[PDB]
Amino acid sequence: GFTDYKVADITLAAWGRRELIIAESEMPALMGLRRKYAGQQPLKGAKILGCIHMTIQTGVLIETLVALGAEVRWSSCNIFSTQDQAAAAIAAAGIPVFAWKGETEEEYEWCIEQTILKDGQPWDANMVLDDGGDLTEILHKKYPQMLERIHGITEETTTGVHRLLDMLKNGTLKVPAINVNDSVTKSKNDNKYGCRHSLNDAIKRGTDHLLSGKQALVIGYGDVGKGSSQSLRQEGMIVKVAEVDPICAMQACMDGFEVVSPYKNGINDGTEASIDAALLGKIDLIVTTTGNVNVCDANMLKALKKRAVVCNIGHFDNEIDTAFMRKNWAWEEVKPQVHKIHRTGKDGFDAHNDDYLILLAEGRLVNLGNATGHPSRIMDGSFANQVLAQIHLFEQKYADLPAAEKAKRLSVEVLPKKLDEEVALEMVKGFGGVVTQLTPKQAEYIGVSVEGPFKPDTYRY
Amino acid sequence: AGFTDYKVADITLAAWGRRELIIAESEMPALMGLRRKYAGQQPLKGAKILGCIHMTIQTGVLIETLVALGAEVRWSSCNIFSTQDQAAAAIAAAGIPVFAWKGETEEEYEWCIEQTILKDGQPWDANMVLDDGGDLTEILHKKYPQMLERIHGITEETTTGVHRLLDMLKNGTLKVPAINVNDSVTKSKNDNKYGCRHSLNDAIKRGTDHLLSGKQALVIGYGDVGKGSSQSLRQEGMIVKVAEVDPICAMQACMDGFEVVSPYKNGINDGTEASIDAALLGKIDLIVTTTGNVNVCDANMLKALKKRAVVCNIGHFDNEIDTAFMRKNWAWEEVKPQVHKIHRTGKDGFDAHNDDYLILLAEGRLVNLGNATGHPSRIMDGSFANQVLAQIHLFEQKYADLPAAEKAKRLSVEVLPKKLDEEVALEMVKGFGGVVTQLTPKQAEYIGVSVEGPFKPDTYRY
Amino acid sequence: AGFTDYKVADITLAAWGRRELIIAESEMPALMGLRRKYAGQQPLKGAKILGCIHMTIQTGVLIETLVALGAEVRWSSCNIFSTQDQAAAAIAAAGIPVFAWKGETEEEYEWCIEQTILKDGQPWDANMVLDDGGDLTEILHKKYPQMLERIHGITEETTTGVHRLLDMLKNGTLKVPAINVNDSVTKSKNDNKYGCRHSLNDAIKRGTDHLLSGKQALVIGYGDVGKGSSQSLRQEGMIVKVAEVDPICAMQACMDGFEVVSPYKNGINDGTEASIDAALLGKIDLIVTTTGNVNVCDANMLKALKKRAVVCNIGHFDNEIDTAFMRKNWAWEEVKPQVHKIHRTGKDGFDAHNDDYLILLAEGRLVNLGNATGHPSRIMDGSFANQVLAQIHLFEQKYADLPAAEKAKRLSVEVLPKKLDEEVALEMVKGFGGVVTQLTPKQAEYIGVSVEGPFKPDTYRY
Amino acid sequence: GFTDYKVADITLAAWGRRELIIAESEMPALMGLRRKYAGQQPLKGAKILGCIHMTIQTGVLIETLVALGAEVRWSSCNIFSTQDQAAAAIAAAGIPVFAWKGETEEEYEWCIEQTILKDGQPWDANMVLDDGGDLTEILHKKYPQMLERIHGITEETTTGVHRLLDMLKNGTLKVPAINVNDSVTKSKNDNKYGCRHSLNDAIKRGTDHLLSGKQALVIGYGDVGKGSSQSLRQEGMIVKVAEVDPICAMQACMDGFEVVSPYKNGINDGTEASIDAALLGKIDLIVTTTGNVNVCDANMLKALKKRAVVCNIGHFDNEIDTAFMRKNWAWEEVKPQVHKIHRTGKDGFDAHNDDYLILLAEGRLVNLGNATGHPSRIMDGSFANQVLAQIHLFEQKYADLPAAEKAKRLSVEVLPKKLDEEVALEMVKGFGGVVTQLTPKQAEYIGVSVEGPFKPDTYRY
Ligand SMILES: NC(=O)c1ccc[n+]([C@@H]2O[C@H](COP(=O)([O-])OP(=O)(O)OC[C@H]3O[C@@H](n4cnc5c(N)ncnc54)[C@H](O)[C@@H]3O)[C@@H](O)[C@H]2O)c1
Ligand SMILES: NC(=O)c1ccc[n+]([C@@H]2O[C@H](COP(=O)([O-])OP(=O)(O)OC[C@H]3O[C@@H](n4cnc5c(N)ncnc54)[C@H](O)[C@@H]3O)[C@@H](O)[C@H]2O)c1
Ligand SMILES: NC(=O)c1ccc[n+]([C@@H]2O[C@H](COP(=O)([O-])OP(=O)(O)OC[C@H]3O[C@@H](n4cnc5c(N)ncnc54)[C@H](O)[C@@H]3O)[C@@H](O)[C@H]2O)c1
Ligand SMILES: NC(=O)c1ccc[n+]([C@@H]2O[C@H](COP(=O)([O-])OP(=O)(O)OC[C@H]3O[C@@H](n4cnc5c(N)ncnc54)[C@H](O)[C@@H]3O)[C@@H](O)[C@H]2O)c1
Ligand SMILES: Nc1ncnc2[nH]cnc12
Ligand SMILES: Nc1ncnc2[nH]cnc12
Ligand SMILES: [K+]
Ligand SMILES: [K+]
Ligand SMILES: [K+]
Ligand SMILES: [K+]
C-alpha cells in the first residue's frame, strides 16, 4: 500500500528492475561505494531532494543513496529524459518518484513540487542533488526557509554550476555547493566520452540516417563539443566546428577539424547578410553544445540545407530558436521526439514538400530525448562523485553552524583529487586495466606519494 | 667574418639553414605576429638572455625574434642529439653566439652551456634566462650563483624543468622568479601532446623504416606526451597498450580505446625477474617511455622484451630507460648514427647475423629530436610565442632591481594570464584559416564573460 | 476498398510508415532516379515478382519502385525479426500483398512465404523472383517446381543466397537463371561493409546500452561484413581482435591495425574443450560472427566466454552460433524483446541476481536488423538500385519463353555490367553532393578508357 | 677485382649490409621462399635483367634470386628512388648494379643500358624483372633480338601492367608476362598500405610541415589514392578526394571524405575559367595518385593557395605539369628533392617572396624520392610474388617453344590464388597472427578445401 509517486506505467517496474540489475554490473565504482559505506551508514538521517534525468543510471544512484541511509524524493530535470521503466522500478521499491517521458512544462514543474511537498507541507530535507539548477532555483526563490535545514547542494552539470557561481558572486547562495561537474572522472568522462557514445546513438534512433560522408556543423568545442564532434567524425562525417574560444578552436584544428563561423568574419549582427549562406547550404546536420543562448538562430535555420537535421545536446533548448520555428513554420510529427519543420509556411504543409528541417527532441537534450543518454559505465564515474559529494557535505553539517562559521564555510568547491583518483581507479578496474605502482625511488623522483595524489591541482589532463 | 664567438659543426650549412628559417617563419604566425607587434617598441632592449633549448630551426625563429625585439643572446642546446646543424650555422652566421651541434659528448654538452655563461673567460652580464629542462638553471644556481643577482627571471619550457623549479622554490633555493611556459594551454595541450603525435612515428620511421601497422606497442605513461605518443602509434595501425601510475590518466587511456596493462604482475615492481609479466613483454614490438620519471623501462623489462623489439624514450632525460645496464652487459652495434642494435648474447662482440637483439633509438635520449627534427614549426609557434611573452613580462618586471620586500612578493613560479594564452591561440587558429565566432553582447552576458575574453575560468581544463 | 490480401502486425501503423517512406525516398537518389527514368516505359509491365527480403522501410521503397515500373508483387520477409511493422503496414495499406511482422515464429515465417507463392489457395502466376538468402528460392525448387517453368529469373541479394545458387548450378538443379546482385561493387563494397559499420554498433547500443569504448571485442570473420563490423566497433573505441580462416583476409586485418587471433590454440578446432584458448575468451566482452559459415562460435567457446559478455551474429543465418546448445543446457531470461540473458548455472530456473550469464541479441539472428533497423536508406539505395536493374534485365530476357535447347545455353548466374555499377555509384556520389571529375579526351586515351567509362577492367578489385 | 657496377659510394656497403640483415628479419614470406627453394635451385640458368627501385627491400629480392641460381644485372626504375647504401652492399656482393640517388635522365638510360650490354655486346639474358615498363620498352624497341631468348617478364606496378596490356592488344608484345601487381598480397598491400606508411613519411622529411588541421586534395582514389588519403587523414588533415571513377568516388564518400573536382562541375575545358579557384585557393597540399597525365595541370598550379605543397606518388612525374613550371617559374632548391617554385616570374626570385609552391622530388614518386618508399614488411608481400613469378615463367621456357605453342602462352597472367594465400599466411605469421583452421564440416559447408583456396577468383577482398 504505497502511493507517494506518479509514473507513466507502474507495470514496467519488472522490466526496469531487470535493466537495473544489468546496470549495476556496469557501475563498479558506484556499487563499490555501496560495499565500502554500507556498514557505517554515512547518510543515515539524510533527506535528499534529487532532480536529475530519471534513467536506469539514476536509479542505481538513487538506490546507492538509499542503501547508505538516505531518504529521497526524486524528479527528472528534463521533460523527455525519463526512462519509464526506470521510474516504475524506483516507484515499486517504495521511493517517491515523479517523472515520465514526454512531460509538459506544467507537469515538469509539478513533479519538482511533489519532491518539495510531502502531504502539502515542505519535506524536512537537508540535502540537495540537482542537475541544471532548476531545483536549486525553485528552493532559493519560492521556499527560502527550507534552505536553513539543508547542509549543501551537489550540482551535476556545467549549466547548474554556472548558476551557482552567480549566486556565490551575488551573495545569494544560502548553502554551500559541490561542483560535481569539474571532477575529471565527471567532466572529462561524462561530458566528453558520454556524448561521444550517445549523440550518434540518438541521431540513428531518431532518423536512421547514414552519417558517413555527410556534412556536420558542431557549435562549440568544450567537453560536450569535443565528444559530440568525435561522435560524428568516427561515423565518417565531415565535421566542421564553431567556437568563440580561441583555445578550444585551436584544439579543434589540431584534432583535425576545420573551424568555421556561421557568420561572415565571425560577426553575428542579427542580419541575413551576415550568414555564410554557402556554408549553411551544405550542412546536413547541426548540433549545439554550448550551453549558451541562441547559437543556432533563425537566420541560420533559414539558410540550412533542405532536409538537414537540427538537434541540441546542451542542457537547455534555447540554444536553438525553436520559438521562431513554432511561430512561423508548420511542424509534422514523424514520431515521438522527431518533427519535420516545413519552412513553406504555418498554415498547413504539403506531405511531399522537400523544403523541411528535421528537429530532434523538440530541441531538448537529444541524447536523452531520442535515446537513453550516457551508458551505465560512464555514469558510474559521475554518480560515484555524486555519492561522495553527498557524504562530503552531510558529514560537515553546514546548517548546524552558527552564522559566523557559515560565512567562512560557504563556497562552491570540487572534490579533492584523492577522491577523483579513487573513482578513476575503480573505473579502470572495470575495464580490467592494471595500474602500475610507483617504487619509493620513483615517487621520490617526481615528488609524489605512492598512494597519490599523482598530479598537482593545476594539472589539466 | 671577424666574428668567431661560436662553435657549430659546419658553418657552411648556414645558407641551407636560412632557407628553412624563411620557410618556418611562414609556418609560425603567432611568433611572427609578436615580432611585428613589438618590433618598434623594442621591449627587450637591454635584455641579455642565456638560452638553453634544442638548437632546431624552430628555436632559430625564437632566437631571431628575441633579437628582433632588442635582446642579446648566448645560446646552446639542451640535448646532445637535438641540434639541427643547419639551424645552428644560420644562427652563428647571423652574428649570434651559439654553441651546439648534433652528436655532442657529455663533456662538450657541459662545455657548450659554459660558453654561453662565460664571454672571454669571465661571466657574461646576463639578466634573463630561457631554459628547457633546467640544466642551465641548475648550473647557474650551483656554479655561478653570483650571476643570478643580475638576472630578472627564468622562462622554463618543459615539464621536467618546471618540476625542478618548484622543488627549488619550496626549498627556498630559487634565487630568481620564473614563468611556467609549459603550463600554457597553447603549450602543454599543443606542444607536449600534438607535437609528439607528429614526431614520434616520424622519428621511428627515419631510424628503422619499420612498418608500424599491425605490430604491438607499449606506451609507458599517459600524460600529455603519452597521449600524443599513443595517438602517434595508434593512427599508424599499431595495437597500443598503455601503462600508468595515475588512475585518472589510466581512465582516459581506457576511454580512448587502449588496453591498460602493467609491465609487472599486478603492477607491483619489487625488483625481481619474477615480477615481470614476461608473457606481455614477450609480445611487444615497440616500447616508448613518456613519463619524465626514472627507470620506467628497467633491466628486467629489457631482458623480457620480444626479440628485435624497438626501444626509445620521448621524455626529457635518458634515465627513463636503464641504458646503463645495456652498456654494461650487452654489445652495441651501430646500424647508423643514433641507431644501435643491442645484442643480448654478451658483451664481447656479436654475431653479425645474431637474431637476439634490441634496436635502441637516440641512445635513449629524446627520440623525436634525436632521430628526426622534433615538433613542427606550426606547433612550436604556440610554445615559443608564450616564451617571448614570458621573456617580455619578466624582463619588464626587473626583479633584480626591485627592493627586498618587493623581491619577496614576486619570488614565485607563475603562468601567463589566460588572455595572452587565448591571443596566442587566436593567431594559431588564423594560421589554419579557422574563423572564430564573436559573442553577441547578450550571449556574453548569458555565460558571464566579456566579448573580448577570457572565456573560461582559471579552473577550466580544456 | 476491401483489400484483405495481406497479413501484418498492425495496419494502423501505415501513416507512420508512409511518413518514413517519404523521408527514405529523399535518402535514396539512385533508386528514385530509376523510378523517374523508367516510369513512362513501364519495363516491368507484366512482371509478377515473388519477393522475400527484410520488410524494412528501405525494402518498401524498393517494392514501390518495382510497382511504379509496372510490376505486381507478393512479399514476405527473409527473417523473423527484421520486419519494421510500420513499413509492412504502409505497404499493405497501399494495396500490395505483404505477409511480414517483427517476431514471427518459424511456422509463421514459412506460412508468410507460402502466402506469396499461393493466391486464393492456388499457385500465383509468378514469373520473377527477388530473394535474400535463398529460402524462397529453395522452397520453389523443392515444393513448387512447376512454378519455375514460368519464372524468368532470380535476383539474389546476399552472399549466402549466392552460394546456394552456385551449389544448384554445379549440381544441375538450378531451374532458372539468376543475377548475383551481391557482387556489384555498389552492393558488396557498400551494403556488406559500410552498412554493417553503421548498423552493428547501433543494434548493440539499442539492445544493451553498453559502453563499448575500452572493452574487448572478438570479430569472427574478416570478409566484407567482418571488415565493416570490426570498424563499427573499433571506431567506438573497442580493442578489437579478429579471427579468420582466409590468410589474405587475415593479412588485411593485420594491416588495418587489428590483432589476428584464433579461438582455438594454434587454430586447431578438435572439438574438445581443451583446444579452446580459455585465457583469450575469458577476456572478451563482445563476440560477433560475420562468416556465413556454421558453428563459428561453438558451445565450448560459449562456455569459456567472460561473464556477462554479449553474443550476437550479423551473418545471414543464426547457425553461426550454437544457440541450440544454450537452449538445451542454460536458462533464458528475457530482458526485453530480442535481448536474452542466458544463465550458465543450469537449465531449470535461475537466480535473478546470478552473475554468470551471457547476453544474446536477437536469439542469434541478424543482429543489425533484429535489434535495430539494419542498414540506412542511403546505403540500401545502392543495393536496391541494382535489384531493380537486375529484375528489369532478367524479365526483359524472357528466359521461360525459350525452347528447351536455348534455355540451357542461357542457364547461368551472372552479375550486372560494370557500366551499370558505375552509373549507380554516380547517383550515390551526387547524393552526398560529391563532384566526379570528367576525363579529357587525351587523358581517356592515355589510360585506354572511354570518357564515359567503364573506367576499370573487370578484374579490378577496388 | 670486381668493377662491373656503378654506385655512388662503395664505402656505404657495410651500412647497407647491416640494414639488409634487419630487412631480412622483416620479410618472412620472401625469406621463407629463399629457404624453401634453395635446394632445388629453380632459377639456375636464369639471367635476369632487373629494373626496379634499388632500395634495401630490393636488395633482399636480388639476393633471393641469386640464392636460387640466377644471375642478374640491375638498375633502378627511378632517378631518385635508389638507397645508395643498398646499391653499395649489392655491388660489394659481386652483383652488377648501376644505380644511385639523384641520377640525371641521361644517367638513367645509361644505367639500364649497362644491364642490357655486357662488354659492349648484348648480354645473353633470358628473364626480365621490371617496375614501370621502361626496361621492357627499351628491349622491345632497341634490342628486339634479345627478346628471342627471353622467357618472360614479371612486371611490378599498375603503370607497367597497362603498358603490357597495350602491347598485347596491339600485337607488339614479344614475350609472355606475369602481372605481379594484381596479386592481392601486392595490389591491396603494397599499393594501399605502402603509401599509407610512406606518403606522410616523405612529406615530413621533405618539409617537416605540421599536417594536422590543414587542407589536402588527393587526386585519385584507387589503391594508391586510398592509402594516400588515409596517410594524410590519420595525421589530422582535412582531406578532399577527386576521382573520375564514380565507384571509387563512392568509396571515398563512405570512407568519410568530401569528393570534389578541381574544375567547376568536373568539366576541364582547358581555360582558367573552369578552375574552382575558391576550392584550390584553400588547399595546403595536393597529391596525385592516378597514373594518368596532367591531373594537376598548369591552371591548377596557378590557382593553388600560396605555399601549398605539391607532390606525386604515381609512377611517372607527368601527373603534374612540371614542364610548365620549368618554363614560367623560378626554381629555388631548399635541399635535395625539395624546391620552392616562385610564381613571380622566370628570371630570378626574391629570397623572401611569399608566392611560391613547394615541389617534392621534382614530381617523381615522392615516397621513394623524399623517403625510403614502402617498409620491408610490406614489400615482403610484393617481392615474394616476384620470386614466384620469375620461377614460373623461367620454367615455362617460352623462348624454346614452337610457334603454335607460343601463341597459346603469349599472354599476361596473374599468379594462382593458392600462392596468393600462401604468401599472406607467412605475412600474417610475421605479425604473430594465428589463422583458424576450418573443420571438415565447415569446409564442406562453404564448399572449400581445408587448405584453400578459400575464395573464388571473382572475390574482391
Ligand atoms: N547532454 C549531455 O549528456 C550533457 C552532458 C554534460 C553537459 N551538458 C550540457 O552541455 C553544455 C556544455 O557543457 P560543457 O561541459 O561542454 O561546457 P564547456 O564550457 O566546457 O563548453 C561550451 C563551449 O561552448 C562555447 N561557446 C559558447 N557560446 C558559443 C557560441 N555562440 N558559438 C560557439 N561556441 C560557443 C564556449 O566557448 C565553450 O568552449 C551545458 O549546458 C551542459 O549542461 C550536456
Ligand atoms: N620530446 C618532446 O618533444 C617532449 C615534449 C614535451 C615534454 N617532454 C618531456 O616528456 C616528459 C613528460 O611530459 P608531460 O608533459 O607529458 O608530463 P605528464 O606529467 O603530464 O606525463 C607523465 C606521466 O607519466 C606517468 N608516470 C610516471 N611514472 C610512471 C611509471 N613508473 N609508470 C607509468 N606511468 C608513469 C605520470 O602519472 C604522468 O601522467 C617530461 O620529461 C617532459 O619534459 C618531451
Ligand atoms: N546483416 C547484414 O546486413 C548482412 C549484409 C550482407 C551480408 N550478410 C551476411 O553475412 C555473411 C558474410 O557476408 P560477407 O559478404 O562478409 O561474406 P565474405 O565471404 O566476404 O566473408 C565471410 C568471411 O568469413 C570467413 N570465415 C569462414 N569461416 C570462418 C571461420 N570458421 N572462422 C573465421 N572466419 C571464417 C571467410 O574466410 C570469409 O572471409 C553472409 O552470410 C551474408 O549473407 C549480412
Ligand atoms: N609510389 C608508390 O609506392 C607506388 C606504388 C604502387 C603504384 N604506384 C603507381 O601509382 C599509380 C596508381 O596506382 P594504383 O594501383 O592506385 O592504380 P589504380 O588504377 O587502382 O588507381 C588510379 C585511380 O586514379 C583515378 N583517376 C584517373 N585519372 C584521374 C583524374 N584525372 N582525376 C582523378 N582521378 C583520376 C582512376 O579512376 C583510378 O581509380 C600508378 O602509376 C602506379 O604504378 C606507385
Ligand atoms: N534496411 C535493410 N532493408 C533491407 N535489407 C537489408 N539488409 C540489411 N539492411 C537492410
Ligand atoms: N621500398 C621499396 N622498394 C622497392 N620498390 C618499392 N616501391 C615502393 N616502395 C618500394
Ligand atoms: K543509458
Ligand atoms: K621540426
Ligand atoms: K534502416
Ligand atoms: K623502406
Coordinates of N, CA and C in Angstrom, one line a residue, chain A residues 198-262:
Chain A
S198 N 26.5 8.7 -27.1 CA 25.1 8.8 -27.2 C 24.6 9.8 -28.2
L199 N 25.5 10.6 -28.8 CA 25.0 11.6 -29.8 C 24.6 10.9 -31.1
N200 N 25.6 10.2 -31.7 CA 25.2 9.4 -32.9 C 24.2 8.4 -32.6
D201 N 24.2 7.8 -31.4 CA 23.2 6.9 -31.0 C 21.8 7.5 -31.1
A202 N 21.6 8.7 -30.6 CA 20.3 9.3 -30.6 C 19.9 9.7 -32.0
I203 N 20.9 10.1 -32.9 CA 20.6 10.5 -34.2 C 20.2 9.3 -35.1
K204 N 20.8 8.2 -34.9 CA 20.4 6.9 -35.6 C 19.0 6.5 -35.2
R205 N 18.7 6.5 -33.9 CA 17.4 6.1 -33.4 C 16.3 7.0 -34.0
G206 N 16.6 8.3 -34.1 CA 15.6 9.3 -34.5 C 15.3 9.3 -36.0
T207 N 16.4 9.2 -36.8 CA 16.3 9.3 -38.2 C 16.7 8.1 -39.0
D208 N 17.6 7.2 -38.4 CA 18.2 6.1 -39.2 C 18.9 6.6 -40.4
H209 N 19.5 7.8 -40.3 CA 20.2 8.4 -41.4 C 21.7 7.9 -41.4
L210 N 22.1 7.5 -42.6 CA 23.6 7.3 -42.8 C 24.3 8.6 -42.4
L211 N 25.3 8.6 -41.6 CA 26.1 9.7 -41.3 C 27.4 9.8 -42.1
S212 N 28.0 8.7 -42.5 CA 29.2 8.7 -43.2 C 29.1 9.5 -44.5
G213 N 30.1 10.4 -44.7 CA 30.2 11.2 -45.9 C 29.3 12.4 -45.9
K214 N 28.5 12.7 -44.9 CA 27.7 13.9 -44.8 C 28.4 15.0 -44.0
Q215 N 27.9 16.2 -44.2 CA 28.5 17.4 -43.6 C 27.8 17.7 -42.3
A216 N 28.6 17.9 -41.3 CA 28.1 18.3 -39.9 C 28.7 19.6 -39.5
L217 N 28.0 20.3 -38.7 CA 28.5 21.6 -38.1 C 28.2 21.5 -36.6
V218 N 29.2 21.4 -35.8 CA 29.1 21.3 -34.3 C 29.4 22.7 -33.8
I219 N 28.4 23.3 -33.1 CA 28.5 24.6 -32.4 C 29.1 24.3 -31.0
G220 N 30.4 24.7 -30.8 CA 31.0 24.6 -29.5 C 32.0 23.5 -29.6
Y221 N 33.1 23.7 -28.8 CA 34.2 22.6 -28.7 C 34.7 22.6 -27.3
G222 N 33.8 22.7 -26.3 CA 34.1 22.3 -24.9 C 34.1 20.8 -24.8
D223 N 33.9 20.4 -23.6 CA 33.9 18.9 -23.3 C 32.7 18.2 -24.1
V224 N 31.6 18.9 -24.1 CA 30.4 18.3 -24.9 C 30.7 18.4 -26.4
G225 N 31.3 19.5 -26.8 CA 31.6 19.7 -28.3 C 32.7 18.7 -28.7
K226 N 33.7 18.5 -27.9 CA 34.7 17.6 -28.2 C 34.2 16.2 -28.4
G227 N 33.4 15.7 -27.5 CA 32.8 14.4 -27.6 C 31.8 14.3 -28.7
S228 N 30.9 15.3 -28.9 CA 30.0 15.3 -30.0 C 30.7 15.3 -31.3
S229 N 31.7 16.1 -31.5 CA 32.5 16.1 -32.8 C 33.1 14.7 -33.0
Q230 N 33.6 14.1 -32.0 CA 34.2 12.7 -32.2 C 33.0 11.7 -32.5
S231 N 31.9 11.9 -31.8 CA 30.7 11.0 -32.1 C 30.4 11.0 -33.6
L232 N 30.5 12.1 -34.3 CA 30.2 12.2 -35.7 C 31.4 11.9 -36.6
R233 N 32.6 12.3 -36.2 CA 33.8 12.1 -37.1 C 34.1 10.6 -37.1
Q234 N 33.9 9.8 -36.1 CA 34.2 8.4 -36.1 C 33.1 7.6 -36.9
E235 N 32.0 8.2 -37.2 CA 31.0 7.7 -38.1 C 31.3 8.0 -39.5
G236 N 32.3 8.8 -39.8 CA 32.7 9.2 -41.2 C 32.1 10.5 -41.6
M237 N 31.6 11.4 -40.7 CA 31.1 12.7 -41.1 C 32.2 13.6 -41.3
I238 N 32.0 14.6 -42.3 CA 32.9 15.7 -42.4 C 32.4 16.8 -41.4
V239 N 33.2 16.9 -40.3 CA 32.7 17.7 -39.2 C 33.4 19.1 -39.2
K240 N 32.7 20.1 -39.2 CA 33.2 21.5 -39.0 C 32.8 22.0 -37.6
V241 N 33.6 22.8 -37.0 CA 33.5 23.2 -35.6 C 33.5 24.7 -35.5
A242 N 32.5 25.3 -34.7 CA 32.4 26.7 -34.5 C 32.7 26.9 -33.0
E243 N 33.4 28.0 -32.7 CA 33.8 28.3 -31.3 C 33.9 29.8 -31.2
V244 N 33.7 30.3 -29.9 CA 34.1 31.7 -29.6 C 35.4 31.7 -28.8
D245 N 35.8 30.5 -28.3 CA 37.1 30.5 -27.5 C 38.2 30.1 -28.4
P246 N 39.2 30.9 -28.6 CA 40.3 30.6 -29.5 C 41.1 29.4 -29.1
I247 N 41.2 29.1 -27.8 CA 41.9 27.9 -27.3 C 41.2 26.7 -27.7
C248 N 39.9 26.6 -27.4 CA 39.1 25.5 -27.9 C 39.1 25.3 -29.4
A249 N 39.1 26.5 -30.1 CA 39.2 26.4 -31.5 C 40.5 25.9 -32.0
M250 N 41.6 26.1 -31.2 CA 42.9 25.6 -31.6 C 42.9 24.1 -31.4
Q251 N 42.3 23.6 -30.4 CA 42.2 22.1 -30.2 C 41.4 21.5 -31.3
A252 N 40.4 22.1 -31.8 CA 39.6 21.6 -32.9 C 40.5 21.4 -34.2
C253 N 41.3 22.5 -34.4 CA 42.2 22.4 -35.6 C 43.2 21.3 -35.4
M254 N 43.8 21.2 -34.3 CA 44.8 20.1 -34.1 C 44.2 18.7 -34.1
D255 N 42.9 18.6 -33.7 CA 42.2 17.4 -33.7 C 41.7 17.0 -35.1
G256 N 42.0 17.8 -36.1 CA 41.7 17.5 -37.5 C 40.4 18.1 -38.0
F257 N 39.8 19.1 -37.4 CA 38.6 19.7 -37.8 C 38.9 21.0 -38.4
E258 N 38.0 21.4 -39.4 CA 38.0 22.7 -40.0 C 37.1 23.6 -39.1
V259 N 37.7 24.7 -38.6 CA 37.0 25.7 -37.7 C 36.3 26.8 -38.6
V260 N 35.0 26.9 -38.5 CA 34.3 27.8 -39.3 C 33.3 28.6 -38.4
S261 N 32.9 29.7 -38.9 CA 31.8 30.5 -38.2 C 30.6 30.5 -39.1
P262 N 29.4 30.5 -38.4 CA 28.1 30.7 -39.2 C 28.0 32.1 -39.8

